[PDB]
Amino acid sequence: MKFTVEREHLLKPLQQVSGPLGGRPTLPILGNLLLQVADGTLSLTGTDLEMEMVARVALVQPHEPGATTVPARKFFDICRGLPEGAEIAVQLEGERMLVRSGRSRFSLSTLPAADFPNLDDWQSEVEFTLPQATMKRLIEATQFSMAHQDVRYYLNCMLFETEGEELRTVATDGHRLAVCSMPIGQSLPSHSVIVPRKGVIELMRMLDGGDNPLRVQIGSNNIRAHVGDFIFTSKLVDGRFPDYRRVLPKNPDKHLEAGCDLLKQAFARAAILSNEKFRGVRLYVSENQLKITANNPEQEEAEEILDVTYSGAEMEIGFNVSYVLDVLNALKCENVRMMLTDSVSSVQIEDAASQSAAYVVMPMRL
Amino acid sequence: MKFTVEREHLLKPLQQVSGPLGGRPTLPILGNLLLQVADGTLSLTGTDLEMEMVARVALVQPHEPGATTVPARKFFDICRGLPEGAEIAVQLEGERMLVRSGRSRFSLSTLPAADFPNLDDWQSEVEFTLPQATMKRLIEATQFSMAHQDVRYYLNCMLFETEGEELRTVATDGHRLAVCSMPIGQSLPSHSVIVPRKGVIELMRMLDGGDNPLRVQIGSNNIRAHVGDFIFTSKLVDGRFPDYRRVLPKNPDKHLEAGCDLLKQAFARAAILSNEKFRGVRLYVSENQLKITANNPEQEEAEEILDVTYSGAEMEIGFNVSYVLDVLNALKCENVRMMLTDSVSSVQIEDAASQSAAYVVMPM
C-alpha cells in the first residue's frame, strides 16, 4: 500500500474519521483507522461499533492499491505536526507503515485490515436530499434542549420526524422543549426516528457550511448521511419519544414582543440574584410594559422594567431564567415573541419574524 | 454612604480588585469588597489575607462619606451586565446596598466594614520604577519554570532580585531553570525576595501594557506594585532559593544555532513516538547538522534531521522533550543558541540574539 498526498487534503478527512473513536476501546484495532487505496481513491474509516465515519480523498499522484490499519491519534498528530502544504508519502514495509515528508521519518505499528469491524448490511426505507444549511438550522435550533445522562435514555437523544414536505427535529429534557420544522420540497412518508447524542454531534460536525447537498437514508435501525466526500452512519435508538403536540400551549393568544438583546440582558442581570438551584424569576405584564423580579434565600432582590409591545389582559407568570436565557441565546434575532396564556400555563417563545422554531418553558409559582 | 458613577469608570477597578478571589469563601467577608467614600474618592479593597488589591476612583458627582462591604462577584457581574454608558447610583439602606441604573434596581447583602481585615503594616526598604513592558517580559520569560506543587514551597514561587542596574527573575523546579535580567537605568542595592505564585499572577494581570510606569517597593516581608490608581501588595516567602550562578554550565563551549520554530516543531513531532512515561528524545550533533530520534516500547520510531550551524566535536545527548519544548515556546524569537558541554551535563539555551534570558535543562 502506497500513496502520497498534501497535508491539508488529509487533515479534514482525518478530523471527521477520528470523531467516532471511543476513549477506552474494547478491541485494540478500535484505536486504529482503516486505510484503503483502491481505484484512484484513498478511503479512511473510523468506528466505535455503533457509528462509523468514512472519508474519501482523490489520488492525483502515483499510488499502489492495498489496505492496513494505523493508530488514529499518532497518525493524526504526525500529519497535523508537519508544516503547512507538506507532501506526505506513506508506504507499507512489512508490519510497519512508513510516513515520510522532507527529512522527517516515522515508523508506525499496524494491525491487519482483515480484522477491522464491519457494520451489518441494512436497507433504506425513507430518503430525501436537502441543503446542508437546513439540517444545521434544525440541529442548532434544538440540540441545547436534549437531556444529559437522564435514566430516561430517549431524552438524551434528538427525534427526527418527516411529515408532508417537512423535516422536523424535537429535543426535550423532560422540563423544557425545543422544536424546529423546515419545508424541504419533497413529499415524504410520515416517519419518526431517535438519534443518540453522539450521532447528532457527529452529523452536525460533518456539515462544513458549503454547497454540497446532504442526502439522508433512514432504515429500521440505522440512519446514514452523505455529504461531498464524507459518509456517516449511526444506529438509531428504540423507544417512545414524547409528543411535542401535547406540550405546546393550546391557545397562547397574549403576545409580548420585545427586542431580543434588550430582553436577554434584563433576564441576565435579574438572574444574578435568583435562586442558585431553582432559578425562578417573575414577570408582571401590562400595557406595553414588562417588569421582571428575582430574589434569593439571602433576601437580595433584582427588578428590571422595560418597554415592550403588549396589549393583552394584565397578568403575572414565573419561570426558570436559565431555560429562558438558553432560548434567547439560541434565537439570535432582532425581536422575540412570548406567547402567554395565564399564570398556571406554559409559555411558548419564538423569533417574532419566524415560526420555524418554537420553545416551551413551564410556569413556576413564586 | 452614597455615590453615583459612570459604569465605564467603575468597571476596570472592580475587575482588578475582584478578579483574584479564589481561596475560601468559608470566611465570608473574604468574598466581599470593602467600599469607602472618603474625600471625593471611592476606594475599593479586596484581600485573601496574603495579598491585597486597592483601586481608587475619583468621585465627580455628589456623594456622602461612609463605608460598607458587598459581595465582589455579584457586584462585578451586575455592573458588567449593565449597558455601555450606564450611570450607577449606589446608596446604603439599613443593611442592604441599593444599586440603581436606568430602570434596573438591585438590593445586595452587606457585611460591616468594621469586620473587614486590617492589611498589615510594614516598611519599604528598596524602591525603583520601570516600564510595564519590562515587568511583563521578566515574568513571561521565567514563569513556566516554577515548580507546581513542590514540597520545597519556595520552588513554587519566583525570585525577584536587584543587582547593579538590573531587575532579575529566577524560577526553577529542580530539573530545569529560567533566569532573565533587564537593565532599568537606576543604581540598585543588591536584594533578593521570593514571591508566591498567586502574587506573580496578580503582578501580570495588573499590567495594561500602556504608558503608566510601574512603581515597586520591597520590605522585609512584603512587595508592593503601584500602576495608575491601582495598588497590589503581597506577602513574601521564606526559604533559601537556589543560586542560579551555580546552575549555569561553567564552560559550554560547543555552540549550536538553529531556527526556534523549526527546532520546536521537530521536537514536537519526534515526541509523538517517545515513551509516554519518560518522554525521552536523543540528539545527535555533528558538523552543521542535528539529528533528533525517539522510540517507544512498541518499537515505533521517529527521526528528524535539520540543518544547523555547528562547528566542533560530535556528541550525543538525551532530554525530557517537554522541558525543551517549554523553553522554545517561551523564546518568542527567530534563532536559538544551544550551548553544550558533554553527554552527562546540562545544556544552556538562549535567544541567539540576546543574552538577557538563559535556560538550563538537565540531560536524561
For the residues of A74-134, what is the DSSP string, one character each? HHHHHHHHSPTT-EEEEEEETTEEEEEETTEEEEEE-B-GGGS--PPP----EEEEE-HHH
Resolution of the experimentally solved model in angstroms: 1.9
Assess whether B354 and B262 both reside in one domain: yes
Which of B107, B123, B139 terminates a domain? The answer is: B123
* Other Cβ atoms closer than 10 A to B34: 22
Assess whether B253 and B243 both reside in one domain: no
Assess whether B275 and B340 both reside in one domain: yes
Residue of chain A nearest B106, judged by CA positions: A302
C-beta atoms of B300 and A107 within 8 A: yes
Q: What are residue B219's phi and psi, to 5 degrees? A: -110, -175
* Domain interval for residue A182: 124-247
Let me know the angle formed at the C-alpha of A326 by A321 and A330, rounded to the nearest 5 degrees. 145
Distances (CA, A) of B147 to A213, B23, B150, B183: 53, 20, 6, 26
Assess whether A173 and A234 both reside in one domain: yes
Assess whether B270 and B317 both reside in one domain: yes
Closest CA to B321 of B341, B296, B288, B286: B296
Radius of gyration of chain A (CA): 25
Assess whether B105 and B141 both reside in one domain: no
DSSP A246-279: GTS-S---EEEEEEHHHHHHHHHHHHTTS-TTT-
Residue of chain B nearest A79, judged by CA positions: B269
Put residue A229 in one of left, alpha, beta given phi > 0 → left and psi -120 to 50 → alpha.
alpha
C-beta atoms of B74 and A300 within 8 A: yes
Assess whether A129 and A119 both reside in one domain: no
| B177-198 exposure pattern, b = at least 16 Cβ within 10 A, e = fewer | bbbbbbebeeebeeeebbbbbb
Of A74, A109, A299, the CB nearest to B272: A74
Which of B72, B96, B123 terminates a domain? The answer is: B123
Contact predicate B270/B294, CB 8 Å: yes
Partners of residue A74 in chain B, C-beta under 8 Å: 272-273, 300
Q: How many whole angstroms separate alpha carbon B250 and alpha carbon B245?
A: 9
Residue appearing with cell numbers 430516561: A152
Q: How far is CA A360 from the centre of its chain?
A: 19
C-beta atoms of A106 and B266 within 8 A: no
Of B96, B108, B304, the CB nearest to A104: B304
Assess whether B335 and B236 both reside in one domain: no
Residue appearing with cell numbers 405584564: A285
* Other Cβ atoms closer than 10 A to B343: 11
Q: How many whole angstroms separate alpha carbon B138 and alpha carbon B144?
A: 12
Distances (CA, A) of A22 to A18, A116, A192: 9, 15, 28
Of B96, B109, B303, the CB nearest to A105: B303
Contact predicate B147/B157, CB 8 Å: no
Q: Which helix (H) or strand (E) holds A199?
A: helix A197-205
Assess whether B232 and B186 both reside in one domain: yes
Assess whether B163 and B242 both reside in one domain: yes
Assess whether B128 and B100 both reside in one domain: no
Query: What CATH number does the domain containing A92 carry?
Result: 3.10.150.10
- Domain count for chain A: 3
Q: How many whole angstroms separate alpha carbon B282 and alpha carbon B129?
A: 45
C-beta atoms of B265 and A81 within 8 A: yes
Contacts for A136 with CB less than 8 Å, ≥ 6 apart: A204, A207, A209
Partners of residue A303 in chain B, C-beta under 8 Å: 104-106
Contact predicate A302/A245, CB 8 Å: no
Experimental technique? X-ray
Which of B226, B247, B268 terminates a domain? The answer is: B247
A210: its cell numbers = 458549503
According to DSSP, residue A364 is labeled: B
Q: Using DSSP, state whether A3 is helix, strand or coil.
A: strand
Contacts for A39 with CB less than 8 Å, ≥ 6 apart: none
Closest CA to B260 of B133, B140, B353: B353
Q: Which helix (H) or strand (E) holds A200?
A: helix A197-205
| Residue B32 C-alpha, separation from nearest chain A C-alpha, in angstroms | 14
Assess whether A158 and A204 both reside in one domain: yes
Q: How many whole angstroms separate alpha carbon A279 and alpha carbon B44?
A: 30
